[PDB]
A paper describes a structure:
Aromatic residues cluster in the core of folded proteins, where they stabilize the structure through multiple interactions. Our data therefore suggest that the conformation of the aromatic ring at position 526 is determined by steric interactions dictated by the size of the surrounding amino acids.
Accordingly, we designed four different mutants of JIP1-SH3 (H493A, V517A, V517L and A541L) and obtained their high-resolution structures by X-ray crystallography.
Residue numbers in the entry:
A (entry chain BBB): 489 to 548
B (entry chain AAA): 489 to 549
Amino acid sequence: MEQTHRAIFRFVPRHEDELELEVDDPLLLELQAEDYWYEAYNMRTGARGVFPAYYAIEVT
Amino acid sequence: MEQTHRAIFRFVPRHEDELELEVDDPLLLELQAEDYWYEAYNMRTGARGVFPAYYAIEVTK
């Protein structure tokens, strides 16, 4: 169960459900929801939460 | 009532303070906060709220 996605933009949470992203954070994406929020594990911070879909790219 | 910004990505609110964006929505940007959330008026919908700063680009006109 390794990285599915990589953060490409800085995201600072405003809401308690959100996942903080730094550029190049490795992400394990558990759910790509119909409202364009991704539920993920940040593999750098160990935090879980949601972020806006366009903040990450799919990795090989 | 002049547009400052344009939505470039679909943004569906999860929170009541958030602004729904469709791609190309004209935006009047009222506040660019230190945490990279923008407060805007959506000029298509008439809604107000906040969205993640990378979801919009500045229009130079």
